[PDB]
Amino acid sequence: ATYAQALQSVPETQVSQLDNGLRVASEQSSQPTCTVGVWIDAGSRYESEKNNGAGYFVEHLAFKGTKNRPGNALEKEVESMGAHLNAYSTREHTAYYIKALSKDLPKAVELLADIVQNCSLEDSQIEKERDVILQELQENDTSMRDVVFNYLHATAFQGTPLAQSVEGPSENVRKLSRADLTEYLSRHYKAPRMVLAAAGGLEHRQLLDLAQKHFSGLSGTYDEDAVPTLSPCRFTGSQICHREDGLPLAHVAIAVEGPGWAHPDNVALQVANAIIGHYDCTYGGGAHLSSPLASIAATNKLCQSFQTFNICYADTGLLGAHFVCDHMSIDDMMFVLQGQWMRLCTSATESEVLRGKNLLRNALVSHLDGTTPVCEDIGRSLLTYGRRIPLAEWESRIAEVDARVVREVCSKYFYDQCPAVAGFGPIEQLPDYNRIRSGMFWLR
Amino acid sequence: SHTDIKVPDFSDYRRPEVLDSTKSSKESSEARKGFSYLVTATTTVGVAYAAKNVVSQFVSSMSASADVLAMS
Amino acid sequence: VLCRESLRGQAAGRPLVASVSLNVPASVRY
Amino acid sequence: RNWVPTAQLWGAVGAVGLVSAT
Amino acid sequence: VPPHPQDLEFTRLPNGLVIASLENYAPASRIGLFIKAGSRYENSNNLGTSHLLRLASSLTTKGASSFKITRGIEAVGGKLSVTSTRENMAYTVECLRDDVDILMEFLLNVTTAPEFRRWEVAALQPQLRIDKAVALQNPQAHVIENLHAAAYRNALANSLYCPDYRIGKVTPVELHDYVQNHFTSARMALIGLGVSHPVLKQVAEQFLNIRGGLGLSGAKAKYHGGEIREQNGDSLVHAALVAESAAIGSAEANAFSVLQHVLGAGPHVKRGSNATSSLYQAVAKGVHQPFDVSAFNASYSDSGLFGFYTISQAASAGDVIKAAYNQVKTIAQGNLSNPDVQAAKNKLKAGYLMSVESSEGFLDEVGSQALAAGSYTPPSTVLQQIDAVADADVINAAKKFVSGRKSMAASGNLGHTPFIDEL
Amino acid sequence: WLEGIRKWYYNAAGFNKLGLMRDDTIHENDDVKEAIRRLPENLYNDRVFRIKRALDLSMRQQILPKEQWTKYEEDKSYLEPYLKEVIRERKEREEWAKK
Amino acid sequence: APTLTARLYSLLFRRTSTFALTIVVGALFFERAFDQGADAIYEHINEGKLWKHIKHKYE
């Protein structure tokens, strides 16, 4: 057997839909444990200037006692049954999920339905989670990796929903009332906007019975209004420079406007970002690394780390890169990075593009190993792409990409485009925006 | 927090083609670039006209004068 | 590293295990 | 490979130039 | 549609090398060569030699240059890692299914036929100061180094990271010799995933036949009692207190492993209050601050440690360690209902099944057993092994902790953090 | 066969009168510099002195006594095995960069 | 709809290669256009007074 056959022989994901609106999806395997969860089109982009931080609080309060299982009864019941419970909030996607034994599937689906539908929101507990979030916002303040990314969003998508942090400003956290949380819940947490994903050793029929028996209690449309639909966010080429010499290493994040979840170009952009690659000072290869930026950065010791990212949203995103370096290495790192973008736009060898494809080929198969990443992939895919995309379809789009496609696509999104730049730390060397903007096209 | 930091309003300084914060800039981007890069190109053309004449005149002084051409 | 919520789980789950690689960042599991 | 259309275009740019002043 | 699960095949060569492949029909492959080589098999003289060897995996080999190893693996989208424990070194390659023989070739070249060039090793020396300093940001790491150092005498007291004085002093001859001694047939074990067995066996016969001194077995994990207390000036006060548990092979290991889950093992609910955790609830009722405590359990093929790890403020450490210690002593005296054990067993056996879920953890578990015993025992038998642990074994394990010699390690502002004799 | 002329040319070259071996007189470049850097302490510190003495001779416009002259038979090629490897690795990097 | 100025950017001066070809050719035409225009303006400003106006007279 070969890689192309293995992709085809992979278990086919299956999806059913309840009458009340909920989508229910599953990936069957021969393993004994499983992951099952609930994915929701909810987060910071849906939030507004009044109720920014609602999705975070709700996540904070979610796993504290439900209306039928109070205090820490839910917590005790999940823990005692030998399973894990987890949650997160993306700017566009909130999600709760349980990792458990396959045997435990019915109870897991019930406790998920219990968390979502009938949440308590105890007033004494809101006042405690208020302090917890106020602690956690100071915990994020020290993390320079997160601060520079929140700034990148704030300046890339300035004056729009995407500029907002998922956690929200400290003032909103201090003044967020129960009325706001419950109204945010009643609006956004609903069946047609939700997906129930599962993955492991479990039968699709059974999951659909559990979803029908527990989740069909959710409402299926609106009050004829109150249906919020995403207005597109304006990308703005701009800079934010939090000058702070006291901190040890400068963090820079530069990006151009992204494609959006729907765009086929994403594949060629993933190949593109794989060619430039990513580096950390703990890497083995160093001077002999394939991606010239890493090789140059390793030999000269320009930076501690860099990583090319493609953050995606509904109709836009952030395509670019991130690096952490000494205060005297910012201009050089920036010069090599932009040099690599411009190079890839104008000249791209067939060999390095094949390496770029193979890195991405390996990335897809590496990532979907274990049940939790596959359950995430399902739950995310149905909210973003609409359907689950098979690995064969991905491979078709990777094999589609050759050198000319990478050049046509890189040059489309990068060449002569104003990039959103975010700098935090000892950033006196960080090049002027006109010089950065001059670097976004070439001498040619 | 650092989430208290929102970017101040540039609606005063912005161009008309990017004022609507619900609108994708990409459709205007090529026009916005094309306007500014036209100014630059028009300037370069205007200087190129001048530079050619200035140089040509100095070159012509170095060439054969009127009084030599007369008595040739 | 400020509250009790985040501080949960940081206590040593198992003997530390150092992983270094060609591609992947160097980690210290458990 | 990729510098053939660029070097041809710059070859044209340079050519008309020699026509430009002379 | 559900696909059929295939048996994990198993072969043990005449020269002593353990082989195991699992035909997954997966898109990716996942191959590992596990070796009884690690921090313990260093000695008084040649320290940090496993650490530099762990780092040096991409250096020039006899069949392939350092450049060829890096670029050849990267060009097929693959990745070559090394994962050291105190006992075992796990050289692992990952790639697509059509690029197996290539990564295998490099894997064998690195593990059987490395050159260790004087200049390349000399060039690599400062990387282990970095790699150490990176990991030591996690204070857990340094407390555990100090714990093992103070707990044992010679064998497992060896630090996993290189001693600071040995940075730069590790020779290319010491690496040569450390490989020649330990990277051998009876000590090695080749594991495979997403690959056919016959080719993996034939490669293991053709290339992986080399044998030298040592020949499996080992020395002695001489257990001791110690306390090293590093004054830190840190935000928190990280500490740990253990005693000699059982070695991994016996049912006592499973009793201690259950006792870990009876006590506060580690949280399951995101942003929870640690409900079913025993130790967390014992300390929470006592002192009212930001803290964390958890049950620490190390088990090796020779020996093992068991106890708990405490994180706290300056003054709180005194109360937190005592209250946690007393909660171990209340279990040790015998207050333990049957549902507590039956939950803990369910937590453990679920956690085990979850640990073998991802192919990386699976391969590490197959490679664990291939060295530890020389066999494979599938999950169901491990589930039976857990479920068969009596309540008496849990009370005896908890009692062995309190009765046995103590080993402590703490780092922070330790002004109100007790000694072992003060317990 | 013609080792003679190889021997004649060696003597006619004249670096042996200064007490230099052949590889002391090699023109430095990126490969040679790298090969010289790879040399172990003894061979490096020796070539240092051989060159340091040969320059001191060249200053004074003199040569060594006839017995101290370097011998065609005893002229060790200390630098070659390293320089061959540096060149072969560069050729490999170029052949890999070709694709 | 592709606009007025964007249509220039997209095809005429996105590349710096064509940017110069545009400038050169534009300057080539501009020279003919401007000189001719400003000559005629100066000649209309100074009507009948220059030689070219009174050349037919004595020739």
Residue numbers in the entry:
A (entry chain N): 2 to 445
B (entry chain R): 1 to 72
C (entry chain V): 49 to 78
D (entry chain K): 15 to 36
E (entry chain O): 17 to 439
F (entry chain F): 12 to 110
G (entry chain W): 2 to 60
Paper lines:
This mitochondrial membrane bound protein complex cytochome bc1, part of the electron transport chain responsible for generating ubiquinone for pyrimidine biosynthesis in Plasmodium, is the molecular target of the naphthoquinone, atovaquone2728293031323334353637383940414243444546474849505152. We present new 4-(1H)-quinolone scaffolds that target the Qi site of cytochrome bc1 in apicomplexan parasites. Our lead 5,6,7,8-tetrahydroquinolin-4-one compound, MJM170, is highly effective against apicomplexan parasites and has substantially enhanced solubility compared with other reported quinolones due to its’ new scaffold. Another critical aspect of inhibitor design for this system is minimizing the inhibition of mammalian cytochrome bc1, which shares ~40% sequence identity to the T. gondii ortholog within the Q substrate sites.
MJM170 was co-crystallized with bovine cytochrome bc1 (Supplement A: Box with co-crystallography data) and the resulting good quality electron density maps allowed for unambiguous placement of MJM170 within the Qi site. The carbonyl group of the compound is surrounded by Ser35, Asp228 and the carbonyl of Trp31, while it’s amine moiety lies between His201 and Ser205. The co-crystal structure of MJM170 in complex with bovine cytochrome bc1 reveals a clear binding mode within the Qi site. Co-crystallization validates predictions made with modelling and confirmed using assays with S. cerevesiae mutants. Studies of yeast and malaria mutants, as surrogate assays, and co-crystallography studies with bovine cytochrome bc1 confirm the mechanism of action/target for MJM170. Using homology models of the apicomplexan Qi sites, there are clear differences between the binding sites of the apicomplexan and mammalian orthologs which can be used to fine-tune the selectivity of our scaffold towards apicomplexan bc1. The larger binding pocket of the apicomplexan versus the mammalian bc1 may provide a way forward to increase selectivity.
